[PDB]
From a paper:
This regulation is achieved by borate transporters (BORs), which are homologous to the SLC4 family. The Arabidopsis thaliana Bor1 (AtBor1) transporter from clade I undergoes slow regulation through degradation and translational suppression, but its potential for fast regulation via direct activity modulation was unclear.
Full-length AtBor1 was overexpressed in Saccharomyces cerevisiae, purified in phosphatidylcholine lipid nanodiscs, and the structure determined at 2.3 Å using cryo-EM. Our 2.15 Å structure of the wild-type transporter is solved in the inward-autoinhibited (IAI) conformation and reveals previously unknown detail, including C-terminal (Ct) domain swapping within the AtBor1 dimer. The gate is formed from TM helices 5–7 and 12–14 and provides the entire dimerization interface. The Ct domain interacts with the transmembrane domain through conserved salt bridges and obstructs substrate entry from the cytosolic side, rendering the transporter domains in an autoinhibited state. Importantly, we were able to resolve the Ct domain and construct the model up to residue 645. This revealed that the Ct domain comprises two α helices (H11 and H12) connected by a loop, followed by a rigid hairpin that deeply inserts into the cytosolic cavity of the neighboring protomer in a domain-swapped manner to block the permeation pathway like a “plug”. Our IAI structure illustrates the molecular basis of an autoinhibitory mechanism in clade I BOR transporters.
Residue numbers in the entry:
A (entry chain A), B (entry chain B): 5 to 276, 281 to 373, 457 to 645
Write the structure that this text describes.
Amino acid sequence: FVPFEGIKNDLKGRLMCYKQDWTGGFKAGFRILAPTTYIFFASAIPVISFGEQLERSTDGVLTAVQTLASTAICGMIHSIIGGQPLLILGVAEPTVIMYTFMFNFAKARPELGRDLFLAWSGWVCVWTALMLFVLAICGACSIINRFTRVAGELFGLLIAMLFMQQAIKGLVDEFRIPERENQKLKEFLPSWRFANGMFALVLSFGLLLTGLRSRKARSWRYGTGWLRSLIADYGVPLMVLVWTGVSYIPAGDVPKGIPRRLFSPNPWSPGATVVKEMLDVPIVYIIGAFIPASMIAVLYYFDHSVASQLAQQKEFNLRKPSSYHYDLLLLGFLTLMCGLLGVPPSNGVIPQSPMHTKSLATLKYPVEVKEQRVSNLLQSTMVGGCVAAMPILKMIPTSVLWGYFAFMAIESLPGNQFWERILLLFTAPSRRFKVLEDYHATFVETVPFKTIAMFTLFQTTYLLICFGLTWIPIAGVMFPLMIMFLIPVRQYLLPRFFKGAHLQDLDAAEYEEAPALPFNLAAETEIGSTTSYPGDLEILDEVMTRSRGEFRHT
Amino acid sequence: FVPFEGIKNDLKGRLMCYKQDWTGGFKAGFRILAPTTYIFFASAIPVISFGEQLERSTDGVLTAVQTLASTAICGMIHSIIGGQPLLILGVAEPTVIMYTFMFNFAKARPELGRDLFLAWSGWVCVWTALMLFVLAICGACSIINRFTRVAGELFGLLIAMLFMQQAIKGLVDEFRIPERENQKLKEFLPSWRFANGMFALVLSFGLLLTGLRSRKARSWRYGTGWLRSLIADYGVPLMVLVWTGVSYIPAGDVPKGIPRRLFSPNPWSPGATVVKEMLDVPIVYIIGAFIPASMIAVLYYFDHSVASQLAQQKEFNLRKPSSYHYDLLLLGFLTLMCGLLGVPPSNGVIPQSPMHTKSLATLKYPVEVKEQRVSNLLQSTMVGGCVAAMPILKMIPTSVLWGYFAFMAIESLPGNQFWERILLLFTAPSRRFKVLEDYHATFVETVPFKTIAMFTLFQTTYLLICFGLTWIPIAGVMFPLMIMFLIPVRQYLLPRFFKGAHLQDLDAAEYEEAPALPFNLAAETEIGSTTSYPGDLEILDEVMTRSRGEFRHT
């Protein structure tokens, strides 16, 4: 933990591959645009959704303009002078939640109010930048190996819960009058409001289901290869466009605001740095900003490092070194800059970074990744240009964004072992052989079900407590402390209750899977030792057709 | 083809097992109620949907009351004095289409009009009864072995197309003012109409998707066995109830008719035999009724026999004989009775009859079927009692019935080989190995793809021509003739163009399936000889998690 050692080593390592980092990007030619566009679409849409969320949560102080600007500027700076260009930066949901807490605190205090919210947030960002500088200089990133699966998966499920909560919140508001809108408009009559709510339900569920189906296009037996890849890569934006077009079908027979569209304003309209108002904040609140700043620094020190680790998985066979410490230092500087500019800070986001690395990967029949600084710079510049295209983006209905929130919530589940363990916990004892008939984790076979159940119950209790804490008006801004407390807990307390190899299998740093087992081998196991025979109607359901009741012959 | 031989033989066979047919039903005790209730729900809901369809198509002359009454009375008579009690009778979609054609013909002719439509239909039913008597006496049912798969599957797909068309028709009308309603009501304002249409979309799609998911409950690893069986058996009625309840959520904040509910009237209200008006029909039209009567007799002679055959599949190991000829004779008598009473005739329906037989089946570890006349009688009496419960049924929204129409359309597909062949025809040449990696028909391996393609193209052209003919105002009532022409076509013309075993495999009376093949064996085949290797992103999609981009280790 020698000060400045990690930063110096990272800088020495990354300074030998800068010119190559650029030339290899230019040598790829126009073929570098496909990963660029893919990651640009993967980054922009969630950022716009978070911007709308903030617009609703901050009474219009922060909108999609600010989130897009922060994402673009931070991404460009990271691409040019950052250590690991594979890392993708952007505004994330936890930052939105923290800023919502801060806004709610400031609004109820006359000394700050809505007019000094951004100044107080700038002071918070100054504190966060200092904390991140200290963490990077002291080499705190040398212990990121202790950021085990138990904390990451719990945080992911918490963020998925919050995504779904936001989706439900928005869909319920689609039936209500907005707070800052003229209540006398025809679009806000009870009939038109009910119609708008129903149309929002239709559009949101359509987007969600169609995108979820599109995600598995490359496995279809239909169409061309390029068409299947196009669907699998750009389904989300394609479905957003399709459902916007659908929303425009009744445009001629309904009022202007049916369905409701994005509330974020257009920056080009004449109606439209916070350092000047920063001096006006009372000293007591300048000092008190230390409190949320510590939580934000915790969140960033976790998320940045985890995203970089995921983007630098050893299976990619990357040949260039890592820059964790210098990356955290630059993140502190970027947070200071964003606080001074009046925009929310950005940080490493998941799964955008590993998806970018994958988009830059090819197999030599064996993974080889094309690492360079051009794709990140171009995608960040496109995210920035999206600000100028705000008139076009304002045509998107809000229900589509709520559907996208639900989409992210559901997409956080697939590879999450905590979710699989919850499903197993709620599974019937006589139907676990079914669990054993498909791809499954190894701890299902190597760990007794009682220990899995106890571990999952502890994890679920922790998750529910954190979710409930998020609902407390003021104390809810402490949930990153609860997230970090899982490190010492896993390191010290769990070994007392759990026995070694069981913990290692249940909290493995590597995703270990197992292939499907034959039915005969799925019963000799302890977990599948309570196999019950199928019923008569269960058997007949499979040997007779549903269309005409015809017996199938095999 | 000796006259009265088949009827006499069937009567002699079925007269030796009547008392046992009843006693075995009474000996089953209260356990006979589960199949009874299952088949009652399987029969009632489509009949109510057809009743609403007729109400919209006949300007209120025929409604769900008449369809329910016909189904109940015919089922009871068949249960008591019928030959094969496993056969389930009811009003079917083709009868609805024929009656719609007849109503449209009568309305445009001042000599008949809406006031003599039922009388003309009674004369049509008299002609149909005479035709069926002739067919049964002459032993025309001795050649039902020529009702091959090519005709049955084409007819099924045509009826599925018509189901989906009715669903779309109803959902579009949910946005419009009904023809015979007061246009000044608040519920028919543009805003409330748009809201009603959107709510109808929501409810219909919810019903459809939830029912389709419920159909596969017995294969779940969750819940109890009895709960899974309950879901798999009663999902459709359960989801109808659930979505009706959902429809009642905004009842306090919306006008009376939001959402629209069943239009069929309640027979108990004071506002509410056609032999008297039958004498008033002109002689020319009495004679002309011969034309639609022949088509209806074709439809019934096909459907009754096919449904009985499906209910009497040899795999059920039934120990009692068949009564095809006497069943057709009784169907003629029932059609005469229904025409005299002013209700549409009923006939054998699919897949209700084989599903009833399956519900009466148990495996002795080997199928053993409990054949008796109690379940059919009880379910028919319950269908009849549903008439008295019309006030409760009128609470169902029409959008739920349109969703059920779409549900039947989609449920007609699974075991249909014509649909599978269409999908194969539109499949990519390089992705047929995927077809070979799952359960598939044998002709995929035993027949070249060119012959399958030609056969499927001919069948699809025939189907589309029949569907288009259904759209012609008057000539569309001839489509049963097109259906029957497939018998001589298959028997005489196809062998000229197709070569023996290929036709036998493509038009086998038995549903022949084949198990999944290994990838190595799926390429040596001629059809799977154009296997293309997966792409880099296709490979990476499977080895990395979608939630966090984590490499999977196997």
